[PDB]
Amino acid sequence: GXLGRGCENHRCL
Amino acid sequence: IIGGEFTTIENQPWFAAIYRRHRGGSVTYVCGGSLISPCWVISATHCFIDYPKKEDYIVYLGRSRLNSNTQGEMKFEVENLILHKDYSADTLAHHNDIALLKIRSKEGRCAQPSRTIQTIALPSMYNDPQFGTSCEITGFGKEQSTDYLYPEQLKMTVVKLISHRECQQPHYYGSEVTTKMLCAADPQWKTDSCQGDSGGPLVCSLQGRMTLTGIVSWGRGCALKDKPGVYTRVSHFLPWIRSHT
């Protein structure tokens, strides 16, 4: 989904 | 934080550690934040947007370690969670990535200043340091790509502000970075913020005073060549901050 700064505490992390 | 140094909360006394309680009762670290007034912590909207239930969050002040107690630490709940209405996220870029947490202890008290708990000054309107200025970032984020746990000890590093002109170069971020964002990096790409450092402070000396210049927001990879850390430009959001507090 997405990784890194911006993606903390996301379902798509 | 990639590279940099281990630090302690007395050296970063405005730093807020934000955790979330999960269904089932486990608690995980979410993001950093900065204490801007006794009752208010500022952070990034992206840290909360997928789980915008304020009851789930725990905010610590005066805490140096991720899973151990620090003497003098204060624990808070979130009385009001304010996310920016125009927040959005692209593949890399996050827009209007700023959030306010009104904090309250179980007794209803706000932060009480101490050796390990202090507010950080906001900048003035349109007033940022010049590019090339060395600024500090602080957090509990990853130390290297292969980390599967965040470090137990708080870290800091120092990065230099990068001009908008440089940051919008085609091998940097092109037009994905805007004038509401500040870029900062190590000239040798050896140190940077990383996942888990989001929401935390970028602090610069501005007229001799420690000032909250940025909020960790986004970036491709961490300490990746030609890919600066990107920070919410706090000086552009003062009207929003003033109206919402």
Side-chain angles (χ1 to χ4, degrees), chain B residues 40 49 51 91 105 139 167 172 236:
Chain B
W40 291 98
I49 192 72
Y51 298 87
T91 301
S105 72
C167 211
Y172 280 61
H236 177 271

Side-chain angles (χ1 to χ4, degrees), chain B residues 204-226:
Chain B
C204 310
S205 288
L206 212 29
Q207 275 109 103
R209 148 176 262 198
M210 293 280 89
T211 302
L212 183 67
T213 294
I215 296 162
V216 184
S217 175
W218 65 273
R220 167 103 116 219
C222 307
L224 182 54
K225 184 174 176 209
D226 299 327

Side-chain angles (χ1 to χ4, degrees), chain A residues 4-6 8-11 13, chain B residues 20 46-47 50 193 196 198 221:
Chain A
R5 292 164 284 186
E8 293 88 350
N9 195 38
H10 276 67
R11 279 178 290 282
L13 173 61
Chain B
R20 176 157 80 80
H46 85 246
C47 296
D50 268 15
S193 46
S198 290

Side-chain angles (χ1 to χ4, degrees), chain B residues 41-228:
Chain B
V41 168
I42 197 165
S43 189
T45 279
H46 85 246
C47 296
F48 311 101
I49 192 72
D50 268 15
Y51 298 87
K53 180 181 178 183
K54 75 192 181 54
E55 187 217 23
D56 290 346
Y57 294 92
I58 302 171
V59 178
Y60 285 89
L61 297 179
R63 174 167 273 230
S64 299
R65 302 192 124 260
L66 201 60
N67 283 293
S68 284
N69 300 104
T70 296
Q71 199 132 83
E73 76 179 15
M74 284 188 76
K75 184 180 188 183
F76 301 87
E77 286 174 327
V78 182
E79 184 182 343
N80 198 354
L81 175 60
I82 305 169
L83 312 182
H84 198 291
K85 68 184 151 330
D86 301 316
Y87 170 78
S88 76
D90 281 283
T91 301
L92 291 181
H94 294 248
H95 305 281
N96 298 307
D97 194 12
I98 191 171
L100 285 160
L101 288 69
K102 185 172 193 199
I103 54 165
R104 196 172 51 174
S105 72
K106 273 165 176 165
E107 290 62 50
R109 281 192 294 269
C110 290
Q112 304 226 138
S114 70
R115 192 145 72 87
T116 53
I117 300 173
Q118 295 286 314
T119 64
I120 186 72
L122 291 164
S124 57
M125 203 85 80
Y126 316 105
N127 187 213
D128 306 295
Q130 233 91 149
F131 70 80
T133 295
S134 290
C135 301
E136 171 181 52
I137 44 174
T138 305
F140 284 113
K142 298 173 69 164
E143 301 189 76
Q144 57 209 229
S145 305
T146 55
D147 282 350
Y148 61 88
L149 269 10
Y150 293 135
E152 184 67 21
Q153 187 70 44
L154 189 65
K155 290 186 75 187
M156 65 76 83
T157 194
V158 175
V159 286
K160 292 192 189 220
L161 299 181
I162 286 170
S163 72
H164 183 248
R165 314 86 236 194
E166 177 173 335
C167 211
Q168 63 86 232
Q169 295 297 134
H171 290 78
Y172 280 61
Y173 290 128
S175 297
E176 297 172 58
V177 68
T178 76
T179 57
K180 286 162 56 180
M181 301 172 193
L182 283 177
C183 291
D186 184 53
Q188 246 101 228
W189 313 103
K190 291 297 170 58
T191 189
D192 197 3
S193 46
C194 200
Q195 191 188 295
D197 290 320
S198 290
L202 175 72
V203 170
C204 310
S205 288
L206 212 29
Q207 275 109 103
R209 148 176 262 198
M210 293 280 89
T211 302
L212 183 67
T213 294
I215 296 162
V216 184
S217 175
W218 65 273
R220 167 103 116 219
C222 307
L224 182 54
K225 184 174 176 209
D226 299 327
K227 306 298 165 177

